[PDB]
C-alpha cells in the first residue's frame, strides 16, 4: 500500500493525536540531536519494539513490591516497584504492562508522567471507597528509596510512586498495580520546561532503531497540550497549568502501520515526503522505514505551530539525504 | 479512496478497538432490532452527528449544578448536572463535552462509570490527589429523580457519585472533570448481555439509523470491559468483566474522519469483506452511514473472533443482497 495516505490535512489541523499522551496535535517539535522511541511506535514492516498496543490501554500489573515511607500519619508515601520483564500477562512484551509510559522516573528538573490508580492486595486491610490517587510512573534503578531514572529496559525497574500521603491498611509487601490510562505531566520549580519527555528521558528496549540526524534532516515529534499535575485539583478547568507533551507518531499513523502491510513501499535510506503549506512558506516532512518523521530544520529546535496550516500534500519517495525544504 | 482497507485481519485479531469503550475487539454482536449511534461515529462523507473527536478525550465541562443528599456520616452523595447545549468550549458541538458517553444515566442495565471530580474554586475541600467514581449519562429529572434519556433535545447530562463523603463540597455550580476511561456498572453481572443496549444509546437530531435490510442486520464490535464494583477500582479485574459494544472499530472512525471516502459508495450499497473461519465463512458489509452489517437474521448470538483466519475484501454490492452466513 502507499504511505501517502498516512498524513492528511485533518491529522495536523485538529483530528490527530500523539502516540504517547494522546493529546490533540497542534505543533511539530524538531529534535536536532535525534531520539529513539519504541513504545506504541510502529515501523513500516508492521512491527514494534515496545510493550504497548496501538491504543491507550489502562495499566495493570499483577505483582510488584510495595514500600512505604512516612514520618507522620498523613504523609505516608507509597512506592510500588517491579523489575522489568515481569508483565507476564502482556502478549506484546513482558517488559512492562501494556500502556506503561516510556519515561524515566523522577529521582531525588524534568517532567514526569502522572496517572491515577491504586496499589491493591486481596489480603490487605483497606476498604475501597470509590477513589483512585495520583502516582508518578516511570522506569528506574534503585527503587525503593534511591530512585534514579532509567531509559533502558534490561535489568531496570518500573515504579509507581504516590504523590500524596495514602491511607492506612497498606500491610502487604507485594501488590498489584492498576492505573487509568490518562497521563498528565508533573513539573515544578521556577525553571521552564520546553516539552516532555525530553529525548534523554525516553525509555527504549534493546534493538530499538534510533532516529539520528541526516544532514539538515532531523527527526520531529508531534506536540499537543497536556494538563499539568498540581495541588489545586485533578484537572478541572486545567487550572494547574498546561505544557507540551510530545510523541514520535500520530496515533492514526501508528494504528494503520500495525493494521496494514506497508513493507514494500520504502527502502532503508528513503523518505516518503509530504508538503506542508502555510500562508507564507511551506516545509516538507518525511517518514522513514523505521516509522520516524523528519523535518529539514537543521539546528533549529524551536516548535513549528500548525495553527496556520493550509494543507498537506503528498510528494513521493525521496532519498533521505536530499534536503527537505524548510522555508518558513 | 476505496473502503477495502478499512477492515484487515489485525483489526479483528487483536489490534482493533471499539469506538465507545476502546476495548480490544474480540467479538461481533448482531443487532436484529437495529440501532443508531452518532457519538465518535463517522460516515463515509467525513462527518459526525456526535459531540466527540475520534479519540478518547478526558471529560471537561466548565459549569453545571451540584447538589448533595445525605445524613452526614460518610453518606453525602454528590450529583452534578448540566443541560445539553452548555458545553460551549467543545468546537465539535455544544451538546456535551468531548468524550461524554452516549449512554443513558442509570435510574439490569449497564451504566458508564468514570473517575473524576466536581470542582468550584470556592469549595472548601482541599485536594489530596484523589478522584472518585461517578455514574455518567444523559437524563431527565436531575437532580432529584434522574431517569435515562436517549436524545439530546431538552435533556441533561449527569455525573452522580457512587460513594458518599461528609461535608466539604457546598458551591451550587461547579465544573466537571472526568478521566477518559469508562468501566461498567451493573447490578446484574449475570443477566447483562452487553452494554449499551440499543435502547440506551443517546443520539442527536439528524442521526441516521441502522435498520435491518432483508436478512442483513446491523452489527456492533464487542470487547471485554471491567465491571465497577466495591472490591477495588480495577486491579486484577476482580470486580468482574462485561461485554462493551461500539458501532465502529476506532481505526475505522479515525480513517473516515481523516480521509475522503465520499465517492466510493452510494446509498443502497455495502462494501463487503469475507471473514474466513475454520469450517465456514461469513460476509460483513459497511454502508455510507458508517454502520456495519451482517447476515445473521433474527439471531443475536455473539460471534467470537477467536478462530478467525483472515479478512479478505469482496467489493461493492447492493445492501439488499444477502450477506452470506455459513458458520
Amino acid at each position, epitope marked *: 500500500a502507499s504511505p501517502a495516505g498516512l498524513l492528511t490535512t485533518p491529522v495536523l489541523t485538529g483530528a490527530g493525536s500523539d502516540n504517547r499522551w494522546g493529546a490533540q496535535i497542534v505543533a511539530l517539535q524538531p529534535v536536532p540531536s535525534g531520539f529513539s522511541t519504541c513504545n506504541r511506535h510502529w515501523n513500516l514492516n*508492521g512491527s514494534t*519494539f515496545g510493550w504497548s498496543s496501538p491504543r491507550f490501554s489502562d495499566i495493570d500489573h499483577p505483582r510488584g513490591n510495595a514500600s512505604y515511607t512516612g514520618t507522620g500519619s498523613t504523609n505516608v508515601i507509597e512506592t510500588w516497584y517491579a523489575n522489568t520483564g515481569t508483565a507476564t500477562n502482556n*502478549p506484546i512484551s513482558n517488559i512492562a504492562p501494556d500502556g506503561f509510559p516510556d519515561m524515566g522516573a523522577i529521582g531525588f528538573p524534568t517532567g514526569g508522567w502522572v496517572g491515577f490508580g491504586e496499589v491493591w492486595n486481596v489480603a490487605n486491610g483497606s476498604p475501597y471507597n470509590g477513589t483512585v490517587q495520583a502516582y508518578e510512573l516511570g522506569f528506574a534503578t534503585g527503587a525503593p528509596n534511591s530512585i534514579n531514572p532509567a531509559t533502558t529496559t534490561v535489568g531496570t525497574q518500573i515504579v509507581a510512586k504516590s504523590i500524596y500521603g495514602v491511607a492506612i491498611g497498606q500491610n502487604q509487601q507485594t501488590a498489584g498495580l492498576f492505573v487509568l490510562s490518562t497521563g498528565i505531566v508533573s513539573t515544578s520549580g521556577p525553571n521552564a520546561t520546553t516539552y516532555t519527555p525530553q529525548p534523554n528521558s525516553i525509555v527504549v*528496549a*534493546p534493538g530499538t532503531p534510533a532516529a539520528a540526524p541526516i544532514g539538515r534532516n532531523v527527526p520531529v515529534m508531534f506536540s499537543g497540550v497536556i494538563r499539568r499535575a498540581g495541588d489545586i485539583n485533578a484537572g478541572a478547568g486545567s487550572v494547574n497549568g498546561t505544557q507540551y507533551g510530545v510523541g514520535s507518531q500520530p496515533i492514526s499513523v501508528t494504528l494503520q502501520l500495525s493494521l496494514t502491510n506497508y513493507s514494500s513501499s520504502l527502502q532503508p535510506g528513503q523518505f516518503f515526503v509530504w508538503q506542508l503549506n502555510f500562508a507564507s512558506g511551506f516545509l516538507e516532512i518525511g517518514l522513514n522505514v523505521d516509522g520516524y518523521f523528519y523535518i529539514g530544520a537543521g539546528a533549529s529546535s524551536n516548535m513549528i505551530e500548525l495553527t496556520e496550516l493550509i494543507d498537506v500534500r503528498p510528494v513521493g519517495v525521496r532519498p533521505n539525504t536530499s534536503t527537505l525544504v524548510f522555508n518558513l | 479512496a476505496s473502503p477495502a482497507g478499512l477492515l484487515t485481519t489485525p483489526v479483528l*485479531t487483536g489490534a482493533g478497538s471499539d469506538n465507545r469503550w476502546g476495548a480490544q475487539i474480540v467479538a461481533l454482536q448482531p443487532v436484529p432490532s437495529g440501532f443508531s449511534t452518532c457519538n465518535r461515529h463517522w460516515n463515509l462523507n467525513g462527518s459526525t452527528f456526535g459531540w466527540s473527536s475520534p479519540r478518547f478525550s478526558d471529560i471537561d465541562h466548565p459549569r453545571g449544578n451540584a447538589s448533595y443528599t445525605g445524613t452526614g456520616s460518610t453518606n453525602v452523595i454528590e450529583t452534578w448536572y448540566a443541560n445539553t447545549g452548555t458545553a460551549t468550549n467543545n468546537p465539535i458541538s455544544n451538546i456535551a463535552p468531548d468524550g461524554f458517553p452516549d449512554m443513558g444515566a442509570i435510574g439490569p442495565t449497564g451504566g458508564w462509570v468514570g473517575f473524576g471530580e466536581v470542582w468550584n474554586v470556592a469549595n472548601g475541600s482541599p485536594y489530596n490527589g484523589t478522584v472518585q467514581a461517578y455514574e455518567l449519562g444523559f437524563a431527565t429529572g436531575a437532580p432529584n429523580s434522574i431517569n435515562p434519556a436517549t436524545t439530546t433535545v431538552g435533556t441533561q447530562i449527569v455525573a452522580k457519585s457512587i460513594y458518599g463523603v461528609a461535608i466539604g463540597q457546598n458551591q451550587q455550580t461547579a465544573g466537571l472533570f472526568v478521566l477518559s476511561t469508562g468501566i461498567v456498572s451493573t447490578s446484574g453481572p449475570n443477566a447483562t448481555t452487553y452494554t449499551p443496549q440499543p435502547n440506551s444509546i443517546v443520539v442527536a437530531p439528524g442521526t441516521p439509523a441502522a435498520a435491518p435490510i432483508g436478512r442483513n442486520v446491523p452489527v456492533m464490535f464487542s470487547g471485554v470491559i471491567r465491571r465497577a464494583g466495591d472490591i477495588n477500582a480495577g486491579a486484577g479485574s476482580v470486580n468482574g468483566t462485561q461485554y462493551g459494544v461500539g458501532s465502529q472499530p476506532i481505526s475505522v472512525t479515525l480513517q473516515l474522519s481523516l480521509t475522503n471516502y465520499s465517492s466510493s459508495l452510494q446509498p443502497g450499497q455495502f462494501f463487503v469483506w469475507q471473514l474466513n473461519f*475454520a469450517s465456514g465463512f461469513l460476509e460483513i458489509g459497511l454502508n455510507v452511514d458508517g454502520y456495519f452489517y451482517i447476515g445473521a437474521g433474527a439471531s443475536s448470538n455473539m460471534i467470537e473472533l477467536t478462530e478467525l483466519i*483472515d479478512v479478505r475484501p469482496v467489493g461493492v454490492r447492493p445492501n439488499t443482497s444477502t450477506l452470506v452466513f455459513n458458520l
Partner: nanobody
Amino acid sequence: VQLQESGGGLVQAGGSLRLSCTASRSIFTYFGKAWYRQAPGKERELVASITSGDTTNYADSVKGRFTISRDAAKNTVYLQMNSLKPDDTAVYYCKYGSYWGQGTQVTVS
C-alpha cells in the same frame, strides 16, 4: 530485523523434520506468520499460517501431516513436518509478519 531459517536438509519418506524460523530482535507484530514452499517446476504456495490469535490453517496437501506453532519468547515460529513424502521436496520459506527469509531446502528421499 533478519530471519534465521534452520532445520532443513535430507530425510527419507515417512521421516520427520522440524523447521525453525527466528527473528533477530524481540519485535511484536499483529501480521500473521506463515510457511511457504516452492517445488521444482511449480509455483510458490502457502503451506501453513498462524494468526496473532494462534489460529492455524493449512494447505490441503499438508493438512494432518504439518503443524505450525510459535514460541513468542524465542521470537520463533516452527513447522513440524511428519510422514514426509517426495511431493514435499521444496525450498521452504518462512514469513515472519512482513519479513521473509532466504529459504531452506527440504529433500525427501
